[PDB]
Design a protein around this ligand. Structure first.
Ligand SMILES: CC(=O)N[C@@H]1[C@@H](O)[C@@H](O)[C@@H](CO)O[C@@H]1O
Ligand SMILES: CC(=O)N[C@@H]1[C@@H](O)[C@@H](O)[C@@H](CO)O[C@@H]1O
Ligand SMILES: CC(=O)N[C@@H]1[C@@H](O)[C@@H](O)[C@@H](CO)O[C@@H]1O
Ligand SMILES: CC(=O)N[C@@H]1[C@@H](O)[C@@H](O)[C@@H](CO)O[C@@H]1O
Ligand SMILES: [Ca+2]
Ligand SMILES: [Ca+2]
Ligand SMILES: [Ca+2]
Ligand SMILES: [Ca+2]
Lengths: 234, 234, 234, 234
């Protein structure tokens, strides 16, 4: 039993409230730069992740209760050539000792190991023919790169996106939405996810992003703010 | 400056935390029944509203600050004949002394009086040819029955819907989403709404719903739970 | 089951978030003036109360659960003659339809009617020989003017006091503390209070204060800010 | 700018939400055992600390704002010989890289290094003649083992104590209180502490405790639960 909440209107560099993995770094301007950028231009074969320093308990094996949580964040994906973008950004939950995985289409969160249990909401900017639908899309993933559900997403180059994710334990319902406040455009996806049968009791959480493996298929993956709140009933 | 938050997993009847208007009532089972139902069958020409007992400050004239808030609720709209439904349910904000207005298509929140300023998210089950798009839809309204923006909505007879509404003062962005957790279907709408130039400093808020004026065009409008949270920066 | 929280750094006049009773009023400066003041001088035989507009559920008869809550507020008690002060200020919980009771020593919250169940923390500025200890004191009262426990209080004329009250359902422990931030002085009291066996499921709450009945025994009773938070486990 | 809150009704062992230092450990029963215990009997020369995994921002150098926070926890101090107890338990704030310091009377948080800035509330069970008052006492410390203020404390062997600490930035007021819910006894202390001029922008926080250096002067220092909440205005 327990709870956890926080709010970061921007990110302060060199402060242990985040666990940086791969190429992820925090700029002097307070931006969480998940993937490498060289003189404004994003580089290929990049992978970066950022987890909150502390994990939270998503379910209790003694009481059998499951936590409900919500998280919101703003991010920007900018690309020199809007026709060739890759690979995407994601919010995910995984074991406390989670480490970055495969590059590119794997979004750094997938590589079946029963110890690599993961739930994620993906903002996929490149469709992989072997497991992805057509065009860019939002997706909800459980233990593999192939989403259990997807919906079309009209990505807007360099535009600020506001994301909201919520999980209602009582109905095992995970909802994810993305809005471009400046454009008044919005997208949403929902799926049943039984976290109790997927993830361990305690999990770390945060962001993961990668750029394309092939030249030209690059993009930035910057998070600008982040708030979180969970509650595990006693 | 200030804040307000609450959570009602269900509604308790005969308790002054809600201000009931029109035909609205709370059943012994804890359901907020906005419109009249006779032996299971909803009646026509019904109008009911429910406001939280206390208002909250949505903006401060001294500091110029604007509040950000979120609210979520679950509701059910059941109809004997799914082909003829009317009129809809809405979440709205208005002056503290707000009273029910016109029936039917007006959703009990519209009737231009500068004192009847109102912002609302509507779940419209009947398209009025004079100001509504085709088919059922979600809508964001500011001072009139004609929404500033709408999106198609596939209403599911008697299914439990989860709604989430959020307002980010910094971007004047109002987002509204509806999900049917059991069906994994979802809808969303977003629009710019400058509450500071629309509503007074303090406002009351809650639900309003009406049934059709013509025989046959009836439906229930039941809210099952409600949580709210606002914050006006100092 | 449910929750309620709010924060008022100051009070806005003419806004229905408070239910004013007796002589209570909100000044243009945002001060909650519980008892009458004439040209700076407090008058005798005054009684004023202020309740939050909405009640909250303090315990659930179906689940048997009891809520835990905390509240904090700042207040000032100023008197022309610091040697003759009366009668006091209190924070209390009572049935939703609670109305002001007796003046003076009764603090407007006591008058045995099983329907007038009340729990209160009193900041008593005058010792009534028939039921009060010696000198000014903090007190915890349950159903009567005679406190179940008291502790000495060194009241400081016109000084700003910060009060904190907390109730832990699991241990039925009610704690009340008063601090004069400017003077670094502090006082505290604690007592077991079984709210489940004392109060009804839903209760309204707030402040009550009275001035002395005899000439000269007067004082102001002004609250400057107020925050509250309760949680009833499901 | 930002915020952080959490609640742990008990502690789960082997989970990275806490940073354990010195002899501190979490028992299978969920108790945070700060100092060594051998077969029920606490050992001497022990020192243990526990910090939340993530730090929080206590003040912003760009806006100049200072955070307000509150924390509560329950703890037990049990001793074989209630006549000889040492040394104490404390809640403290310090730089993110804080490491345990001196044993015994230094409570593991003191050793003047401008980089070892620290603010702490101490529950001192042994009076050190060179800097402590008479008998056990609560204390508020800023940069040294000599408290800026103390108050007598009647420690009760093995009894469960509830502690509440609050800091109001606007008045730079730090309040600390201890209550024995079962006994209805209570103690409190308050002092002005300008965290902005004492601590760095970001700080880690938690508990520290030590046992006596001389044989016989031992005691357990167990924390049973912990909740925290801070808010740094934008
Ligand atoms: C499996 C894998 O990483 N596939 C990647 C794909 O995700 C994308 O990065 C592409 C660039 O054109 O290069 C590869 O095909
Ligand atoms: C303006 C107005 O209330 N119009 C209503 C419409 O909203 C709907 O209730 C309909 C039923 O068939 O009856 C009328 O046309
Ligand atoms: C019962 C009662 O109200 N007693 C009051 C007491 O509370 C105080 O106001 C006093 C003034 O000197 O006058 C009376 O004795
Ligand atoms: C400076 C220091 O650690 N002094 C300690 C004191 O704190 C206490 O532990 C005592 C036991 O009798 O032994 C020493 O005097
Ligand atoms: Ca892909
Ligand atoms: Ca319509
Ligand atoms: Ca008295
Ligand atoms: Ca000492």
């Amino acid at each position: 039993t327990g709870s956890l909440s926080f709010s970061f209107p921007k990110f302060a560099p060199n402060q242990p409230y985040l666990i940086n993995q791969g190429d992820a770094l925090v700029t002097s301007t307070g931006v969480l730069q998940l993937t490498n950028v060289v003189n404004g231009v994003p580089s290929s074969k990049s992978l970066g992740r950022a987890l909150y320093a502390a994990p939270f308990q998503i379910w209790d094996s003694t009481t059998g209760n499951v936590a409900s949580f919500v998280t919101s964040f703003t991010f920007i994906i900018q690309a020199p050539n809007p026709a060739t973008t890759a690979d995407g950004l994601a919010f995910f939950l995984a074991p406390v000792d989670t480490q970055p995985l495969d590059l590119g289409g794997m979004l750094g969160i997938f590589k079946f190991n029963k110890s690599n249990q993961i739930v994620a909401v993906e903002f996929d900017t490149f469709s992989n023919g072997d497991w992805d639908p057509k065009g860019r899309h939002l997706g909800i993933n459980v233990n593999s790169i192939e989403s259990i559900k997807t919906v079309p997403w009209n990505w807007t180059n360099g535009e600020v996106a506001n994301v909201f994710i919520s999980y209602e334990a009582s109905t095992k319902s995970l909802t994810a939405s993305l809005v471009y406040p400046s454009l008044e455009t919005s997208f949403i996806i929902d799926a049943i996810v039984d976290v109790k049968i997927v993830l361990p009791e305690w999990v770390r959480f945060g962001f993961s992003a990668t750029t394309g493996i092939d030249k030209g298929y690059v993009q930035t993956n910057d998070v600008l703010s982040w708030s979180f709140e969970s509650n595990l009933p006693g």
